[PDB]
Amino acid sequence: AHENVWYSHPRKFGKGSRQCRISGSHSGLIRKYGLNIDRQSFREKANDIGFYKYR
Amino acid sequence: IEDALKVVLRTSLVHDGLARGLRESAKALTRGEGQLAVLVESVTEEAISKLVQGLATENVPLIKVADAKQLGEWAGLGKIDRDGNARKVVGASVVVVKNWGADTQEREILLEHFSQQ
Amino acid sequence: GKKRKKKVYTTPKKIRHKHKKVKLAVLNYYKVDDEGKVAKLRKECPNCGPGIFLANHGDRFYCGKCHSTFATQK
Amino acid sequence: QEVVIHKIRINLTSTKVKQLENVSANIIKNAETFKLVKKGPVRLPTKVLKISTRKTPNGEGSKTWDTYEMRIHKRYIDLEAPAHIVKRITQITIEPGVDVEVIIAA
Amino acid sequence: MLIPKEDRKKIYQHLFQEGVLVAKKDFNQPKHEEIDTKNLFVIKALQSLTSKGFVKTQFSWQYYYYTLTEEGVVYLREYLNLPEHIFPATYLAGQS
Amino acid sequence: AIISKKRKLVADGVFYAELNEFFTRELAEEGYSGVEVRVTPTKTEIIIRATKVQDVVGENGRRINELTLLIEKRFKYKRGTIALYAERVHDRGLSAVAQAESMKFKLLNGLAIRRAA
Ligand SMILES: [Zn+2]
């Protein structure tokens, strides 16, 4: 819980820098256009964001 | 009698004024914080009250009374399961009020009567 | 499948430091001189304001407010 | 008393077409009933935005992929008209979904 | 929890200021927004009040949502010793 | 702001997803069906099409306040930019979402699965 050791490592880039904003999962994120959502929840809600299957 | 000391206790509980204990009361008294001090005469050691009085004279006034455990009871120590003595036991050696708070119905009377003469 | 064995420590034990309680450490801070003038022991901090006594320890006044900033050799 | 020319430019962004087209036609009608020299609702090439994604949640199974698309359409209109009349035109007749952005370009 | 007294006092008074508060689930965050404190003890105190039965808590998209009930308002007012007549912003009847 | 229109529309979509799922979370016991966002030059209107519109309103109309305040603090929008509008469903039968919620509530109470469905 000490300030200088807990969470001390920088997190500018890498897997743990950006989270799912849905479940927070580190795995398979759509950073493109600022979605930052994993492919799972994207598949779940794509019709709701506006992503539709067209071709 | 002494029905205004509980009032100042409550109003400085509202504004975080009770520097309860000995070191808290001491740090309130040495700084420009100690306003009304209560040191219990009925102490077995019979030394801490002398030290508190000496520091108070140096924030001068004192209202000592007696019966420390009762002071712990009606100072507001513990948890209010019932409004009275819901805490198992507790004892407050010295209670110093730091902020005057809201109500001063009889507070100025009692201090000037006891120590200010 | 994951089946971990019971943990084995190559270390006897390290328990939380129970902080050293002092019986009436307040009295060591002050000394009344025959129902009158009161004297402070150790030292005092000019930064925080009068009242905060400075620890003696090993030739380095260790205040309570400026724990990091004030360890003054004397 | 404002009569100065502003060459103001309005642009539209939305995923759906028909309501966008109604907005454009309504803007054109509102401008022509005010007798404003203009340029038609010129249409930029449609911008299609697609994600390619595995249908599988776990990674097992036959390789199956899918593309998810939006089609945003940007049509803009420029008016060689004063400000206040254009301001009352553009501040009214707005329906949900269509995003309307204005630049004075003065 | 290990919470400073002024910290809990001001988080509670701000909660009474609005009546609703967010605390994103991101831990180790230095300063929570519009409260100037670390979000850790904010979440901890709010869930403690929820457990005591004074705050309604919801989880959504790694976001925490806290709302005040009637007894929660009463107890928070008693904590701040605010006068009875004044009410949080949630009670400020802004009609549609 | 100066953000590309494509990313602005993407943010709009994710905002819509967040809002709809959040209203699924909250107003499930209130028969939430749908949420509609309409961006006007000054305000942004939110409409909650739901079966139990009176329950959504709350006492003194406070719920629609606090929920809106939730949004106001969640997405850093300044005060008075988000306004809540509660509306009755057009016809709760044809709204399959409401039917699913009613089925869920009937099942949670432990009813006849066959008869409920
Ligand atoms: Zn110091």
Side-chain angles (χ1 to χ4, degrees), chain F residues 46-57:
Chain F
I46 190 167
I47 297 101
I48 297 169
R49 194 199 61 258
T51 318
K52 285 185 280 185
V53 64
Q54 294 79 17
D55 205 297
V56 175
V57 161

Side-chain angles (χ1 to χ4, degrees), chain C residues 45 48 52 63-67 70:
Chain C
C45 199
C48 308
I52 179 89
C63 141
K65 253 9 211 319
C66 304
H67 65 82
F70 287 164

